UniProtKB/Swiss-Prot annotation:
The lineage of its organism: Eukaryota, Metazoa, Chordata, Craniata, Vertebrata. Phosphorylated; which impairs interaction with SCNN. Interaction with YWHAH inhibits dephosphorylation. Auto-ubiquitinated. Deubiquitinated by USP36, no effect on NEDD4L protein levels. Both proteins interact and regulate each other's ubiquitination levels. Interacts with UBE2E3. Interacts with NDFIP1; this interaction activates the E3 ubiquitin-protein ligase. Interacts with NDFIP2; this interaction activates the E3 ubiquitin-protein ligase. Interacts (via WW domains) with SCN1A. Interacts (via WW domains) with SCN2A. Interacts (via WW domains) with SCN3A. Interacts (via WW domains) with SCN5A. Interacts (via WW domains) with SCN8A. Interacts (via WW domains) with SCN9A. Interacts (via WW domains) with SCN10A. Interacts (via WW domains) with CLCN5. Interacts with SMAD2. Interacts with SMAD3. Interacts with SMAD6. Interacts with SMAD7. Transmembrane segments: none annotated. It comes from the Eukaryota. Residues 3-36 form the WW domain. The gene is Nedd4l. The chain holds residues 414 to 447 of 1004 of the full protein. E3 ubiquitin-protein ligase that mediates the polyubiquitination of lysine and cysteine residues on target proteins and is thereby implicated in the regulation of various signaling pathways including autophagy, innate immunity or DNA repair. Inhibits TGF-beta signaling by triggering SMAD2 and TGFBR1 ubiquitination and proteasome-dependent degradation. Downregulates autophagy and cell growth by ubiquitinating and reducing cellular ULK1 or ASCT2 levels. Highly expressed in liver and kidney. Also expressed in heart, brain and lung. Isoform 1 is expressed in kidney, lung and gut. Isoform 3 is ubiquitously expressed. This is E3 ubiquitin-protein ligase NEDD4-like.
């Protein structure tokens, strides 16, 4: 896993290398490193 993501944020991949951040607590799909 990757440290730095807030409580609720999760990182995933689109299988094709692309790493996106999916927050389950806020139901967000973010292509960006979460700052909060």
């Amino acid at each position: 896993g990757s440290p730095g993501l807030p409580s609720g944020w999760e990182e995933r991949k689109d299988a094709k290398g692309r790493t996106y951040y999916v927050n389950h607590n806020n139901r967000t799909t973010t292509w960006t490193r979460p700052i909060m």
